[model samples]
Target: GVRYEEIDCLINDDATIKGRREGSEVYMPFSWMEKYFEVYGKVVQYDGYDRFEFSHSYSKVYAQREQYHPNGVFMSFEGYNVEVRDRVKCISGVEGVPLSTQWGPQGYFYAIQIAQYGLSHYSKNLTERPPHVEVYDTAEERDSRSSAWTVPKGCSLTRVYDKTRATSVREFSAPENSEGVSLPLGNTKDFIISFDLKFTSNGSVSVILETTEKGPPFVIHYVTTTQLILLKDRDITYGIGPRTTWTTVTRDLLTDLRKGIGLSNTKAVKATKTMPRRVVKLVVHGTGTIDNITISTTSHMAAFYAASDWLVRNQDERGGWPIMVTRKLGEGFRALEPGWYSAMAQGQAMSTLVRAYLMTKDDRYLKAALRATGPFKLPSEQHGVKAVFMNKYDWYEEYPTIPSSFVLNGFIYSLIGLFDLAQTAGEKLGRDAGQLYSKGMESLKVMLPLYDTGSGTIYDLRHFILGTAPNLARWDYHTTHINQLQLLGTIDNSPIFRDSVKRWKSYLKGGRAKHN
Candidate 1:
């Protein structure tokens, strides 16, 4: 067990493994990272490096911090570059401390300009590359356009912004196929199809939706650019259901753009609403661009079963979905370096399966719940197994490789999923899974301190070394954490979690909270 701390032992840039008396790890140099460094952002070389440098000439500082939209895949730096001070070193003048990471810790990537590098007390940490991965860049420009939508024959032309030039909008005048940009709506009938419609000039917008082959081809339009002029009855797909009265068909361009409805939950609602009702065809005619069209339906027990059946259909033979394939890696998200699992995603979704089981008392949902927890069977790091990629103790990771970023909220959510699973799934979930719930009390103890009792917030903003520093969120996520802890307090009945939830939630309700 001898080790050299002060020796000049040369460690080369090659793969190496470190084995312990209890367990071990293998490190492949040049194999794992770019800037996982943000995991350790608070580690400045000295005290002089604590705050940002002031820009002298520019009068105001420019900054951009990465805050992702909770409901979607959009990354934002919206209010970042504001001038908050009168005297500071402008980025053009001074460089801030040089720090980087494998992937900027979830909440750590920020573009900061100090106005100058000439500050009297300015000190440099290490210089590193900024966040510039291309998948994120290209993925930002994703769409839902398919060949089913053919621009009718004689349409006029103009272009929406395109990163690539080869595919500018080739106009189809009138009477190309008579199905103006037509396509089948995969799952519909009683669903809201939201699309973005941009108006650059004078042109009318039309929408034709078919819910069933039994219906005659129907066309609805605003016939004029200036106002709502109908070519036919405005309510084409109405009366298709009981609450079809609530189904006000909107062809108004800007008025119905996904309308801020999150797609998955909407889909969940639709699936729960009815079993096999699919929307037939949709045709939109206009000179405007339609982008990010998605469906939002209300949720019900039936939707949860539909969700279960769909998961059974989509799951790989082993009963899992690769989240990287399904969801946006998310805010402060990067795929794990060598990861191929989605415990967070699965836990989040499958936990709902448990709720579905409890609500419906159906063995199907429980069995399906059992199916999803199958993958966490791998050896782990802290909870009995080695807890590496798939089996990390508590799945305490945002992605597979980042030991530094043990996501505070994501894990808590995952824990809630598992807690509900053990509560409901019983024997069908089997032994390993049943034993797995013990980690709840174990993890609750670990998770409690991250909750800032004074602020009535947990560390919604989590980190490392240097645990992820506490930061306030646009959403009062602390309340969310406390609420969940209150839930776990109820579920696990742990005094640790129960007391913490009580104290923190009381603090929140008391409105005496403060930010980190």
Candidate 2:
């Protein structure tokens, strides 16, 4: 029979322990031993046992062991082998008991221990050896050494180690109001820099660039500060401020030069003559205020050509120029926006190179034209829609899909380059340029139809072309619209394009047109 009262007392106690019994042997709970020795109250025992012994054995075991089996098996032995014997059944069960140790009587401790004899034993599968260890040195060492190389101030030998390439030279001059120019050759060598500096009575300077070179030049320019202030005061109305002036300045300068010369002009000039000369011409038009302007020149042709060449070689990969080539995308990409912004950097660069070639009759500009068009490949058909990647030889995957809003202007300018190539290179190159131009135009045509006037923007119609939902955004519509207008203006001086420009100008002025 079980004692209900005592069982209740055991259950309700602040701390309790349990055990199992096998015949006369008992197994004790580990917690009982811990309290019985009052191990919690003392950091060290008088038995002089080292701390390591208690920590490794007693403390570790006490923390992990738990009661799993509640009962024990009992066994009965037979009499001596010589005599036959009858045996009674053996009863197997468990018994619990309180423990006793150094703790006083008021404290209760339960301990149980069980031992198995003649039981199977297994060996631990571990090899005995020093524990695997890794070490790192914490000390530092010093060494005393010297080098034989040194630079001396004011020494002619310094020039030997300068290692700077010869300064670039380019010549770009166009008849007033003439068509764009072209370079003689394109992309024959590295390093080209160009600039389109134009002054208007509106008190602003315009800067532009051309070329398909790899990086930005060491220097760039913007509209002069005096021009900006004058424009603000209404002293000049047609000229753009710094922000708007820069893009136009770069684009016009490059485009005008491209029209006057040939896209292959740079190469031709170099092959046919000595190193090209540089030219810088500042033309100002206005009232009597124009008389107040003073100009100076240091070898007019050399400076102009150097400036133009520098601008071309510094164009972004796409042949565009930016307002501040050092801005967000850095100095390596072409910039072609409107106003004084970095608009039409590519067109300007192409234009500058073309003009350079025309002036020098160099074939190098022609090579540059070919190289500039190198990355514009036909798009791959993906699920029925054509897809072209914009950039080359970099993390292009991370870049957005082809025909992006930012690239529309560049595409238009590149088309101009191709057009020049076609004209100068004859029917063979012309066919190639036509195919490339057709491919780009087809892409733009497919993309433009997806525009939603109500949303006041353009969306990437790629998904729709591939039979997916339209996912258009604001930037897509606005930039594409502007770029399309610009492209139309370039391809044909048609009335439709002229009308579109007017509409866009109105839209920019906050008109309530449906497109706006």
Candidate 3:
């Protein structure tokens, strides 16, 4: 029923209508063919005679039907079945279709059958399930209590010292039956006294006064583990004549209390008891008036001790310190800030906090440190930028938004911070942070080679300002800044960065002219 000649004619006609044309050649417009076909009624001739080819090649095999069926509506004709209710309804309502045409049913059926046949043949070997396999499970639960240590009661106390407090003559009586009490009385003489002071976990103070009255012109040297209380003989000698004069030397005992007192490689002295005690023995040389001396504890000293203890317990992980005393979230771990983590902040907060904890032996400061560093797990691409944020990279500009060198420097800084955090947090956290740092360093190493070393400067290829990639040239000024940043990262104070700066200065001085 198909004619080859008719198929060949149709093929030729379609090719002629859509074939490419050369400028030198002229061809009839497609619109002209449509008008000609309409006038000729689907038949054409060369010279008023029918030239229609009846050969099989001229005829293409296509299905024909007598009824119109929409998609989803079943159709059964000549032992063939299909659903076309939707398809027919869609075509029927379309504005372009000819409403008077009875041939619509036949055309629609023909198209449906061809589409169905093609789909069936193409999908025969396809399977519904995917071939690859995957396994998944929920994340493991974490133990909140096991990760943190408990804070000690006296961990945050400040050290205080007690000494003699003299008010009147009644408290100045010497030992009974004492031989000549050689009371030292003079001017311009120095005295020294030594004492043994003890500190407790919760700071407390006690003092024992041992006085020696030597003759005039004797120098007394005073030294103690707490404070240096110096009483000049000259001051006492001036008031004289047994009229009972009392003078007191005051000093603070909390200096360097948190940082242990010891030389390198020496063991640290532990606090003797829960309460601090001081056996303060004083030696008086050339003293004129010694009425009465007594030592009593003050309320302020107790408060100071408590505050110091609390500070020591809340140290940060980086060995720095913070004012706030709080445990870290997610198992007592703190989130370190960007600059702090990278040492840009130089770990000041973390280190200070750690030192405080070490001095007070308080667990709270240590917990704070853990929490501060905990959030700085690893540097990721999306750490700062959000998903929706757009940059030069997103637009596929001539150059990348971030210069390669700047990126490298930032990455290196992050690595350094991680390294420091790891060292303080022990092997586990250290290992994890170290791995991320190493990866970032490796990436930097790979990217650094792209710079133009021959020119002694880095060039941005993405934003060169001419030709196809306009405004994508390397900026010498930007390169110089990036070079400096990179050098800081590498810890190189060499001439390379200096030379880059000089070159950039020269380039800028040239009025930013395009380089060859």
Candidate 4:
């Protein structure tokens, strides 16, 4: 919705936008801001033009005015801080020129995504500060989180010391006429159970977790000569694998239990909500030795830190992280090639790195966190996850395509990272981050309405660009979008976000009851 020829002409003249001219300054219309970006994005696609100087100058001007540039002023550019007029350079080689606000819509309205967070539930549960993250502070603290596996008295299993593996192990023989061993793991919905297991005999071994559900307990059966089967009340075998070697096995108990209890079991499906379901016993049928039976309800902060460590170490020199898989976007467009970067990935990594910096006061983390902002400033054509939509708004693309995916949740999450950086980092760094945050928010406030379908929220705006059908979000994604808006409301307090949250929540209730 911009006059491309008019804006292009203005940019060619003095990089000045038309708005309201004061005695020595000007106030630009907010809608024209989007138009300017759109036209600039278009013109730069041709040869013999560069936006480096102009883009940095405008961003600096916007940030210096506390993210509301009025009066055509700027303060710094590329580290040389000087008077407003002196530092403001444009593509036209004009120095300290005044940009007018006499074009586009009126109203000075304002508001405020990676590797470590590709599958992160961080954004889904951001209603509270820090979003329910767990960490380990000490060894004793770590030890107390996991419950020790216990065996009933007179059980067939006997303690056997395995110095090569760990302190000790439980050796099960399952002798005839003897009741099989039951290793009680108490009650828990979420648990990580890992052990070094070795099968001594070819006879089938069945390790079962007895849930409170009326059906058969979750079972993993090891049969003759390297055949392993997983089952529950039904014959729904989840996996098949090796049987007779000393293998280290780790499993997420809840997920495995759900798979064991197939969707066909309606009673068990309903019973899944019952947390802390009693795990009465571990019934093993064949002879085997289980060593170092470690169980914990949540991932220790140690593991979390290790993930952050991987993010920091694996980060590319361009201050971006890469997802090493090709994401196929169905029809219309080609798949997102492997090793492509994502704005969502960069934003989420920044969030994690910021937390790490705050927790450890490590300058390395802060530097990396700040460095992660590199890609947000560049366009996808240059290997960065940035795009300008309709010359009206600046959007950080989740999936940077030829025309950008305009993913709603991905854009929102990326904004959260910028917000975190702006609120937590030092004054200078914070101001810089505030600029990106502010611009993205400007776009979000205007474009949010387009994402609303009245019936359900959209997952992305790719349909608009590709002329394809609207991609409505699944229920879970809709829930995530609602949670994200609620989190944004904590900081931005925008009516657009608040109203959307209310309407979306209502959709959840009405739709689920009627359709799905």
Candidate 5:
């Protein structure tokens, strides 16, 4: 495989080639000339300095006229106009930019080959015009193309094409304070944030998105210099400067706002620690211009991030986290209160960390999981007992016995946590944790009997409420048991576990199906 330095370029949804560039910053990134392109490309390998070179198959078809700086030599394709306006408000009759072609060549070559889209699956010959996104028309707005549409205050609007409806500001600043525009309907999930701008110089323009009084408002910013960038509280999808990072920001195709771009794969930020709802105050202080804005509530990938942040924010020095927290109607968090010094919490947290590690490939999460391992062994400087108990070694009667075997899933999850924990880090965590895996394996063998092979079912924990109350089987138990077995078998590739799973499927689709 050929290797290159850290670079820049424009690419389409299909991962096709277009324009390429350098340093990942001071960069000439892919712009939304006709809005058919996806901007802010990512590099598999990053280099301090990288540049673009054109070739026949993967190249940029530059069409600048010989003389006079090639002021205006754009492509006039069939669907560029209809495509551009669908995303954001575009000037009427504006088809495409000159010397156009980022993700794919356009000039006089390769145009008809890919047709309208750079990809075949993207090609539909779709030429239909979309309905107007503007809700209201006014006599004042009718006078000029630059005039903006009208909407009631606090109502959600992604973009107002005309200048009348947009907020014109010189320098807006977000001071980690909440005293401006407020989101009417607050949501924990992610949504869209957009604005129109005209830049005169290289600088940042920002807005306070979520926060409450006496809290540091979560702010979002548009950094424009050699290229465009997006930033939140701490996370950034910046495509400019020395450090370029991944951004969930993509040219959203969900809604037609004439030229709108919203961030996917990310959620809106909470202004401060104790904020109740989202109240966005405008703060613009840069060499750039601002206009109409949009905040979409439909889609934003913030819930998972919020969840992980909650865990990190509340993690204790002992490498555990508070399982739950309670507050009044409105209260800022002072500290994460510890409640459950529990195996379930630790096990689940470790499992979550494992996923996070797999997702991010970060060592921090691995370390977090390792920190949690202490509790499984000699934890809390007080109790030196093992977190998991062995057969005939624990407080309750033999776990392999009827009553104890009832809570098989409980042991299964912890077993999974220990096994995954060790499997993930392995040599890094050292062989000291091997005993934990041994314990999990020992525990697994003892509990597998809970699965009643003949009846094609698994039972629940037997509780001594009145006497020996044998747990009954339910459909949910099947799902619960099978999921654990599936995960376990995939890793351990245990013969019995796989066979049991095979038997489980046959029971559901075969034996169980015949009954229905």
Candidate 6:
């Protein structure tokens, strides 16, 4: 029933799979990744000091890109020149972050731009430039494809028409006392605001996003030669500066609003329970020419729908999704020899399917999601993710390593799946899921202290089983741990998770002082 071709189609340099971290890793073979491709964008490589790192697993070398759909990957490729072909290996990555790999050589890797372009567009024979084809710098560019800018009293607006582009630029000159220009953005809970701007003189320019009700406006107050400040409620500066050239600024409104409005992650997430307060107006302050003022959603439901169908179509009878590649953990300390399943993957897949059901009221998605709880039922001895922690509490293992590495983050993420399932799946069909959520929560409440090192948190309890050294989480992983806690705190409304968050935050302060 497995479509080996569909599995192989994703292999090679055909696509780039991003990671949760900073740098890209090549050769990630998890089946759940079909959902990621639809949501994320591709990257264009450059030649500066940038060099590709290859990870060798079972005679194949994989390379990966670090950034997600919006911000493209920027690397320094110094030794390599344009059109130069260097033989390397295959690329695969699940998370983002720079990491050194140990692998022997393979094919001629072209310049970053050509290489990324070739792979993304399926132009394998890159011997010549494809004529009459316009190449765009973004993941998906349409040769095909804004609103009115209202000028207030004492503020003037004029058009600087462009012969090449579709939309003309609006040059606004406003006095210090003026309200500048305003545009009605309509009502939207989630949106991305993008624009191209150029400062005319040594003046200040501000782009402000205001809501009709909910919270304070998000402001991008800029001093051309001095400073660029991002503020929420007129404070909280996200440090960045403006360049002299025409610069493009993209802001994810929901994320910006949360930070800008001084709302906690828990509060921000809780707002989703109901119709969120919409951003109504976009107000500009200062003197500049702003072009292509655009507002759009980051990812569409169609892609998410396609991902849900992929899960329903490819899922095995066991209701588990497999990673169709050989994966080595701890440098081959233990291996999931191709086609192994993970609790984390099952949890996420369940999360996705349940969401699909919620959106469409589709029974197929609900059925698939209910079946996904299979792995949590059996023990690790039966190729299941369920393992007994401290010989008492039931735990779901992410790695399923021998003696089970009790990974904290993956386990929490898995618990989140159960939490979602319990809430969405109704009382009759969701009874078991509700129980699992309670079970997982109870286990975590007790186990949270074990992960705490007093100085910092350990990623997993591999040391407990193998008597090996404790694997301290990296700073980002620690942050993920904290964020996950915030999510759980928001939903569960528990004292333990809340207190744990406060305690863990203090650890970051301590770790920075000691580790730095």
lDDT (Cα, tens digit) per residue for candidate 4, span 300-369: 3333354356567767898877665466666776677766678777776667677667668878877887
> Tens digit of lDDT per residue, candidate 3, span 1-516?
222221111344555343223454434443445454321224457676866422111111112232211111111121221122222211111111101111222222122122222222122212123222211111221442331212122221111222454222211112222221222212111111111222111111112222232333212222212221222431111111121223232221211111111101212222212111222333222213233222222112222222233334433454322222121212222332222222212222233334344446666644554444432342213222101112222111111122211322223334444444445556864465445545544544444434433333343322222212222224433443343334333333445544444544444333232467
Quote model 4's TM-score. 0.50
In the range 44-89, model 5's lDDT, one tens digit per residue, is 4447656543211111222222221101111212223222322222
Cα lDDT tens digits, model 6, 335-437, are: 7765666777777666666766766788998888788888888887676789898789999878776667889987886777676677778898889888887
TM-score to native of every candidate shown: 0.41, 0.30, 0.22, 0.50, 0.40, 0.45
- Score residue 360 of candidate 1 by CA lDDT: 64
Candidate 5 regions exceeding 4 Å error are 1-301, 324-338, 358-363, 378-406, 430-434, 456-459, 463-467, 509-516
Q: What lDDT, from 0 to 1, does candidate 6 have?
A: 0.55
Q: Which is the winner by TM-score between candidate 2 and candidate 4?
A: 4
Q: What ranking emerges by lDDT with the best candidate at the front?
A: 6, 4, 5, 1, 2, 3
For candidate 2, lDDT tens digit of each residue in 74-147? 01101111001011000000011111111111211110000000000000001122222211111122321221
Error of 6 at 68 (Å): 24
The Cα RMSD in angstroms, rounded to one decimal, for candidate 6 relative to the true structure is 24.6
Worst 10 residues of 6 by lDDT: 90-99
Error (Å) of candidate 6 at residue 431 is: 1.1
Off by over 4 Å in 4: 1-190, 194-251, 256-294, 300-303, 502-516
At residue 64, what lDDT does model 1 achieve?
16
TM-score of 1: 0.41
